[model samples]
Target: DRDSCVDKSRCAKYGYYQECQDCCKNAGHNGGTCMFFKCKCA
Candidate 1:
């Protein structure tokens, strides 16, 4: 499900999600979403 981010480890973490788009894209996803400080990329 959430594994679409290429790896859930990074996307599953609770941190600065504002830059999560870059982080997720680097992880191999097309894009990402940051809600409630949680980063979920797809």
Candidate 2:
């Protein structure tokens, strides 16, 4: 399920910010935040 996304590091590693956001939000958190080198689901 989308809500199974609990690993921001993995998501970031893949460079899927939008996907991460969708998963993060689905997981009941905020959206995803991208860094200069990586992204994090906030």
Candidate 3:
């Protein structure tokens, strides 16, 4: 079981890349994104 974000990105709030991108951007990141249902803000 991996606890890292790579395997633990449970951000179900994203069904579309647009929402995920907005999520990351709202977190204070520039043009961030999401992958595998994970909000990538870094």
Candidate 4:
């Protein structure tokens, strides 16, 4: 159920830290975690 996540503020509010972390790790993002962009995990 991993959908396009929201900003850090919202993610934190919803306790989506793990999901957010996974999103960043999978998407190769550093600044933020939840984003509308693709995971880019090729």
Candidate 5:
């Protein structure tokens, strides 16, 4: 699957939080966390 937060620029932009959450959810993960300016599935 495609990653929601592909890079720092995308994650830094607003609305990507929900995007990351959805991305993780779709990946069967509980959620996502920000680190190194990117979203990591948790």
Candidate 6:
């Protein structure tokens, strides 16, 4: 959905918000970072 990706800042190297939402559901993301989202696993 291109409409879902209006803000390029919300996009990652591997995915968009929609893709990130599905992939890293439990992850927290910053602006224009990896996969549009990141999982904090420590």
TM-scores, all candidates, are 0.49, 0.42, 0.40, 0.34, 0.51, 0.21
Question: Which of candidates 3 and 6 reaches a greater lDDT?
Answer: 3
Query: Candidate 3 residues 1-42, lDDT tens each?
Result: 333432434455444455555555555665445555675655
lDDT of each: 0.57, 0.58, 0.51, 0.42, 0.57, 0.35
Give the local distance difference test score of model 6.
0.35
Q: Give lDDT tens digits, candidate 5, residues 5-29.
A: 4452235333337666666777777
- Regions of model 6 farther than 4 Å from truth: 1-16, 26-42
Clash numbers, per candidate: 0, 0, 0, 0, 0, 1
Off by over 4 Å in 3: 1-16
TM-score order, best first, reads 5, 1, 2, 3, 4, 6
Task: Give model 6's TM-score versus the native structure.
Answer: 0.21
TM-score of 3: 0.40
lDDT by residue (tens digit), candidate 1, 1-42: 345433443443454454667767776766577655466775
- Candidate 1 yields a Cα-based lDDT of 0.57
Off by over 4 Å in 5: 1-9, 13-16
Task: State the RMSD for candidate 4.
Answer: 8.3
lDDT of 4 by residue, 1-42 (tens): 544434332444432355556655655555343334322211
Residue 29 error, candidate 6, Å:
13
How well does candidate 5 match the true structure in TM-score terms? 0.51
Looking at candidate 1, what is the lDDT of residue 34?
Answer: 61
lDDT of 6 by residue, 1-42 (tens): 443322332444454344435433433433222442441121
Model 5: residue 37 alpha-carbon error in angstroms: 3.2
